[PDB]
Design a protein around this nucleic acid. Structure first.
Ligand SMILES: [Mg+2]
Lengths: 126, 205, 234, 96
RNA sequence: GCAUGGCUGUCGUCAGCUCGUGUCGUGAGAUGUUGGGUUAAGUCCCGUAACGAGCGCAACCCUUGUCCUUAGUUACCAGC
């Protein structure tokens, strides 16, 4: 059919993104988009790959995201929807490889090592 | 300094000497059995050289495979020691005990068997090097591709802690792919305590 | 060969210069025309013919003759008029210690006897990691496929370039067939050839005599290989 | 059926010793399902007299593994339990 | 703990440290291991009285990041 499955992970988050033709229906975990992400700039960051590919009005969007942090789930959707947009063709492939959206951000947290206190901070001597 | 050459390869080269699953309520009641078995058996089998004592636990009892390079000393006149110990391993380890004995053909290619002979020679007042130049070439006529033997201790002197070091062949130690034996048996002379280390290198992969 | 116009046309007579000079060689000189030394023309060919007399004397006696003198410029005639079953040769720089350290070279020819056959199989770059080393071993150990014994005839084409092999020869006592020049010293070489190494014609007309005298030595050895078993012409 | 052992070169190599040796006898047994793994870290000090910042840390694992029958009609695996236990596998039975 | 074995710190995860045979030196030595280029690296290439070999560095191990196959309860809810 026209249902399109999109996943995306960033900072231990995971978002199921479904994409199908509709009229601006943006719903996440049975919540509105302005209601879910309370008072942040990432309310527009989830639209940034969408408005780049000039399809902001032409699809239903159904998002289910689990785990992660507050602004880590918003990055999971942004990576998640870019994989769902490229199930169509590779016309928007070059519009997103150049945009720097398709690559999953590999930067994950680092473990505490013995002798040190943080991942790299160490106590003071004299 | 030179982390133990079994503890880095439990996995890619060798396996444990004892396999049994235990719950968290009986895990520390099978270890104290299996650690005073090995102190018992080696004090009895001081002769008839022993390299490895494996222990399996099947359903609810036991199994033990004692390895000697001279099984006829232990099985003497059809198990006069086998059934005698099997009565008395149950007195330390309340389950019924199996005892099984294999051979260690090529006894000069396992490190425990070699290093027990070094303590024997160096307590007969044999020279510290004539004992060991002959204990490496004999273990190079047949078998291995590299041998290190370190002999450290008093070495007869007054206030002397020197280390003999002799090597032949190839011995890697930072390759996890390889296959290395290791053993430390000691020696009590009429003065001082001599410790001997052995690094028999068999074939790789 | 023994012809005089072979000596005149090849460019034998001329030397290096007048300041590059050695008076231990100066007995065998003729003049100093136009600041370039002219070698003697009349004492060469009695010495040159008697050199080939003892080449042929060895060549029918079941032994080896070694050709050296690797210069990349004019040593290709040594690459060309050799490589047959009775004469080893060399292609790269003479290794420091070959006649005297021959026990090591017996161990290093063990790699040579495998990596030709080992390229039957040919991962991807791992084949190139070992087929690269076949080029260097071909460059140096390739000319020697013989093993066993020591060569009974060292034919040095240039004495001033290789004092290494002459020293290692006289430690063992093997004959050295040297070709000296004006500037090089006539000491260490056994059967001298007071010639020149400054033309492609002179380096070729010294060597057509040598590889032909061993063919007739092999033709003499084939004449004498029946003498080894049968006694009627022996 | 549930299985507990200490290394995946036994416990995931004894399920085929049960899946093949029960589906042969007619009854349907589905594919085994993995579970989460027990992981226990043990950081121990290494020097006899003290030097604190030299340490060494180990880890003991426990692999779990769950089978699933469909139609129970075979007591064949009930006799073949001493076969399917080899060295360190424990099998609690849940014959679904 | 200056009679010692065992076990750990340290220089320092720093790129070094040695041997066989050979030649030079009356000898202690030295050469290989220096030169040009290059490298996280005695890592490589070209050179060269040295030719080789070992320890090390690299890789072999673990984990994290992409996809594929095998698997669906206690996990999973797109379709019903
Ligand atoms: Mg150095």
């Amino acid at each position: 059919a026209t249902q399109n499955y999109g996943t995306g992970r960033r900072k231990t988050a995971t978002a199921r993104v479904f994409l199908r033709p509709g009229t601006g229906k943006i719903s996440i975990n049975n919540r509105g988009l302005d209601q879910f992400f309370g008072r942040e700039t990432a309310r527009m960051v989830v639209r940034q790959p969408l408005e780049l590919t000039e399809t902001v009005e032409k699809f239903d969007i159904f998002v289910t995201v689990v785990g992660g942090g507050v602004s880590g789930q918003a990055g999971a959707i942004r990576h998640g929807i870019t994989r769902a947009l490229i199930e169509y063709d590779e016309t928007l492939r070059s519009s997103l490889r150049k945009a720097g959206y398709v690559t999953r951000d590999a930067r994950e947290v680092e473990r505490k090592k013995v002798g040190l206190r943080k991942a790299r901070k160490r106590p003071q001597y004299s | 300094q030179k982390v133990h050459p079994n503890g880095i390869r439990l996995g890619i080269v060798k396996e444990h000497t004892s396999v049994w699953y235990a719950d968290r309520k009986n895990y520390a009641d099978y270890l104290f059995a299996d650690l005073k078995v090995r102190e018992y058996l080696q004090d009895k089998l001081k002769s008839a050289s022993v390299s490895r004592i494996d222990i399996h636990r099947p359903a609810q009892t036991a199994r033990i495979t004692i390895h000697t390079a001279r099984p006829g000393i232990v099985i003497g006149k059809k198990g006069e020691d086998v059934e005698k110990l099997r009565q008395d391993l149950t007195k330390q380890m309340g389950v019924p005990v199996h005892i099984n004995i294999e051979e260690i053909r090529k006894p000069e290619l396992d490190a425990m068997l070699v290093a027990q002979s070094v303590a024997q020679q160096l307590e007969r007042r044999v020279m510290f090097r004539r004992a060991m130049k002959r204990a490496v070439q004999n273990a190079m006529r047949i078998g291995a591709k590299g041998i290190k033997i370190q002999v450290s201790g008093r070495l007869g002197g007054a206030e002397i802690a020197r280390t003999e070091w002799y090597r032949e062949g190839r011995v890697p130690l930072h390759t996890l792919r390889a296959d290395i034996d290791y053993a430390t048996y000691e020696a009590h002379t009429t003065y001082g305590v001599i410790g001997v280390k052995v690094w028999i290198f068999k074939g790789e992969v | 060969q023994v012809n005089m116009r072979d000596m005149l046309k090849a460019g034998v007579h001329f030397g290096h210069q007048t300041r590059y000079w050695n008076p231990k060689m100066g007995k065998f000189i003729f003049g100093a025309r136009n600041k370039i030394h002219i070698i003697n023309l009349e004492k060469t060919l009695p010495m040159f013919n008697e050199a080939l007399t003892f080449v042929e004397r060895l060549a029918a006696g079941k032994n080896k003759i070694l050709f050296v003198g690797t210069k990349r410029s004019a040593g290709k005639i040594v690459r060309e008029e050799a490589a047959r079953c009775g004469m080893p040769y060399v292609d790269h720089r003479w290794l420091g210690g070959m006649l005297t350290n021959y026990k090591t070279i017996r161990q290093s020819i063990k790699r040579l006897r495998d990596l030709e056959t080992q390229s039957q199989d040919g991962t991807k770059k791992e084949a190139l990691m070992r087929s690269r080393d076949l080029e260097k071993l071909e460059r140096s150990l390739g000319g020697i496929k013989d093993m066993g014994g020591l060569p009974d005839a060292l034919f040095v084409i240039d004495v001033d370039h290789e004092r290494i092999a002459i020293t290692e020869a006289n430690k063992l006592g093997i004959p050295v067939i040297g070709v000296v020049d004006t500037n090089s010293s006539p000491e260490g070489v056994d059967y001298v050839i007071p010639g020149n190494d400054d033309a492609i014609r002179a380096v070729q007309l010294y060597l057509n005599s040598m590889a032909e005298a061993v063919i007739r030595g092999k033709q003499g050895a084939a004449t004498s290989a029946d003498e080894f078993v049968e006694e009627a012409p022996a | 059926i549930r299985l507990k052992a200490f290394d995946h070169r036994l416990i995931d190599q004894s399920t085929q010793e049960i899946v093949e040796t029960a589906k042969r006898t007619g009854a349907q047994v589905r594919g085994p399902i993995p579970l989460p793994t027990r992981k226990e870290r043990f950081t121990v000090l290494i020097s006899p007299h003290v030097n604190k910042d030299a340490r060494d840390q180990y880890e003991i694992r426990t692999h779990k593994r769950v089978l699933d029958i469909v139609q129970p009609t075979d007591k064949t695996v009930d006799a073949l339990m001493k076969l399917d236990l080899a060295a360190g596998v424990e099998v609690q039975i849940s014959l679904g």
